[PDB]
């Protein structure tokens with residue numbers, strides 16, 4: 154697996170507009186909401202769950218990086234894997250997307266896989 | 268269990284106004300006080316205690332997040348489970364509420380579980 | 383044991399004015415000095431030692447919180463237990479007070495045991 | 497092995513201008529891009545992968561330092577080992593450079609091996 | 611052992627002026643250069659090496675504190691133990707000093723062993 158696998162999904166020129174932290178089934182988790190910097194389109198929501206899925210090792214790295222990009226409001230590319238989370242109320246509140254990477258986008262193209 | 272369980276309680280548009288760190292019964296803990304951004308109501312107090320209660324795994328995550336939101340003073344939704352801490356002097360000083368989640372808020376919507 | 387135990391001591395309306403980190407007998411430790419926000423009174427010195435005293439479990443959390451309050455300079459209530467550290471040269475450089483809690487304050491009141 | 501070995505390569509007077517976090521083959525990783533402070537030259541890209549290469553032990557310290565230098569925008573010397581990463585889509589997105597050190601730079605010199 | 615042992619060396623009224631992070635012999639390490647706040651004297655250099663020397667337990671505490679004092683540029687006292695690192699190329703690049711403590715300094719005094 155890799156953040157950059159073409160089977161994952163990514164969204165360029167976004168900003169992190171919201172951040173949530175909680176716990177589910179003994180695991181810490183966080184979720185972020187992103188929107189296009191220019192205001193177009195609809196939001197992207199993605200979560201990371203510390204004890205769960207092949208992406209679990211990156212939970213702290215992703216949380217720390219999400220917090221920094223959230224604090225700056227700088228443009229980013231968000232990378233997700235769709236259709237991972239399953240608890241229906243959790244998915245309906247947030248989404249089934251697993252957060253799998255974050256790329257800064259301060260130049261012409263975002264610094265990450267495409 | 269989940270932050271967003273309907274048996275938990277939450278309060279929207281709160282500002283984290285105070286922060287305390289201490290130790291109780293072998294465990295570091297922290298408590299926060301929150302007040303309505305609009306100045307109404309009565310404060311909410313909640314604590315997290317390392318290695319105690321079902322919420323223990325998220326102690327460090329919630330401490331770091333509480334510190335950040337305390338530093339910005341931004342309006343948040345605070346999620347708690349009531350009647351978790353039982354040490355009576357602790358409860359009298361703070362509350363029995365276990366902190367179980369924190370959500371940022373726009374002016375119209377907080378980003379977290381509700382209803 | 384609890385930060386708020388009557389057998390501990392506390393000082394309100396203080397600012398953390400100095401910070402020191404070191405090691406003793408294989409244990410990292412730190413010390414802080416505090417002074418009244420208004421300039422009155424006598425300084426308070428306390429230390430936490432990572433592997434020593436009943437307060438060992440709280441070392442990292444108090445170090446992180448001390449650094450935060452040190453960096454803001456805001457008014458705090460410092461909680462200590464007297465007569466804990468015993469190495470004479472250490473006590474004479476710093477004091478025998480163990481740091482056991484830190485509470486934020488406003489003008490007339492602080493958020494913590496009293 | 498040492499950051500300073502002559503079989504590594506380094507580039508002075510650089511600024512970290514992009515940062516990416518992800519995961520590959522169960523390992524958290526991050527990449528940075530640096531550009532000369534004065535606008536000359538070609539960008540340098542390097543990545544650290546949490547449990548791969550002889551440089552695995554310094555992953556966390558170099559991620560934290562990369563983040564610090566990125567946030568200040570100060571001039572640094574970046575130390576890499578060339579030709580380490582091998583997954584082609586990863587190398588072509590980023591590079592084969594392993595990140596092995598970061599040194600702050602003044603006007604005329606940098607604080608690190610050279 | 612103690613930061614404050616008389617067999618150690620300290621230098622007061624210093625500013626941390628450079629910071630370097632790398633890896634040696636499986637150990638992440640950092641070094642700092644300090645110079646007098648008033649611009650006099652010759653610089654001091656000291657390193658901390660993750661799982662090396664009696665001072666290893668304090669590596670993370672000292673790295674976090676060095677980073678903070680580096681970021682503010684405030685006057686500090688640096689405490690070292692001489693003649694610890696033995697690799698000659700490493701010593702020649704940096705020094706044999708082990709960093710063993712850091713103390714904030716006011717205009718009047720420094721908060722640490724003397």
Ligand SMILES: CC(=O)N[C@@H]1[C@@H](O)[C@H](O[C@@H]2O[C@H](CO[C@]3(C(=O)O)C[C@H](O)[C@@H](NC(C)=O)[C@H]([C@H](O)[C@H](O)CO)O3)[C@H](O)[C@H](O)[C@H]2O)[C@@H](CO)O[C@H]1O
Pocket residue numbers: 162163164165166194
């Ligand atoms: C002219 C051209 O090169 N492409 C056409 C574009 O007009 C059109 O809209 C574009 O947005 C583009 C961004 O492409 C991605 C991205 O965000 O990087 C590519 C992603 O794979 C895609 N993600 C998914 C799950 O499909 C993502 C997503 O569609 C949007 O972010 C949702 O808003 O778009 C690029 O910046 C273009 O320059 C810009 O005009 C895109 C449609 O994505 O393709 C062509 O129609």
Ligand SMILES: CC(=O)N[C@@H]1[C@@H](O)[C@H](O[C@@H]2O[C@H](CO[C@]3(C(=O)O)C[C@H](O)[C@@H](NC(C)=O)[C@H]([C@H](O)[C@H](O)CO)O3)[C@H](O)[C@H](O)[C@H]2O)[C@@H](CO)O[C@H]1O
Pocket residue numbers: 276277278279280308309382
């Ligand atoms: C009683 C109730 O469940 N909801 C009341 C509303 O009908 C009403 O209008 C708005 O309610 C807003 C959102 O209500 C919450 C919140 O803070 O998000 C919902 C929480 O479940 C509730 N928590 C608990 C333990 O009861 C919480 C709480 O009542 C207040 O925060 C206490 O300070 O309120 C929000 O409260 C607005 O005040 C209002 O626009 C009004 C009644 O007129 O208050 C709601 O409680």
Ligand SMILES: CC(=O)N[C@@H]1[C@@H](O)[C@H](O[C@@H]2O[C@H](CO[C@]3(C(=O)O)C[C@H](O)[C@@H](NC(C)=O)[C@H]([C@H](O)[C@H](O)CO)O3)[C@H](O)[C@H](O)[C@H]2O)[C@@H](CO)O[C@H]1O
Pocket residue numbers: 391392393394395423424
């Ligand atoms: C003792 C006396 O003569 N008068 C009492 C005063 O304590 C008090 O005056 C106010 O006291 C305020 C807070 O008192 C503490 C504090 O800092 O919170 C209480 C602590 O337990 C105490 N710590 C110890 C080890 O004794 C601490 C300490 O004495 C001082 O902080 C050292 O400077 O004081 C605060 O000091 C205010 O400045 C003052 O207004 C009055 C209030 O009516 O009640 C008396 O009991």
Ligand SMILES: CC(=O)N[C@@H]1[C@@H](O)[C@H](O[C@@H]2O[C@H](CO[C@]3(C(=O)O)C[C@H](O)[C@@H](NC(C)=O)[C@H]([C@H](O)[C@H](O)CO)O3)[C@H](O)[C@H](O)[C@H]2O)[C@@H](CO)O[C@H]1O
Pocket residue numbers: 505506507508509537538
């Ligand atoms: C006396 C002298 O300096 N002669 C030539 C210069 O014209 C120039 O070098 C100056 O010094 C700078 C230091 O060069 C490095 C560096 O970045 O520290 C040395 C590195 O080993 C080298 N790395 C690799 C993999 O080759 C690195 C690299 O070439 C450049 O950074 C890529 O941009 O340069 C630096 O070179 C300055 O540009 C210059 O002021 C150069 C050639 O112009 O080499 C000297 O022979």
Ligand SMILES: CC(=O)N[C@@H]1[C@@H](O)[C@H](O[C@@H]2O[C@H](CO[C@]3(C(=O)O)C[C@H](O)[C@@H](NC(C)=O)[C@H]([C@H](O)[C@H](O)CO)O3)[C@H](O)[C@H](O)[C@H]2O)[C@@H](CO)O[C@H]1O
Pocket residue numbers: 619620621622623651652
């Ligand atoms: C003879 C002598 O060594 N020192 C005295 C002068 O230094 C002194 O002027 C003051 O000295 C201050 C420095 O004292 C230390 C320090 O940095 O705290 C003491 C340290 O033990 C010493 N470290 C070592 C390994 O020897 C350290 C070191 O010599 C200097 O830092 C190197 O620059 O100095 C400080 O320098 C002030 O500038 C000044 O107040 C005068 C005071 O009357 O008497 C001398 O005997």
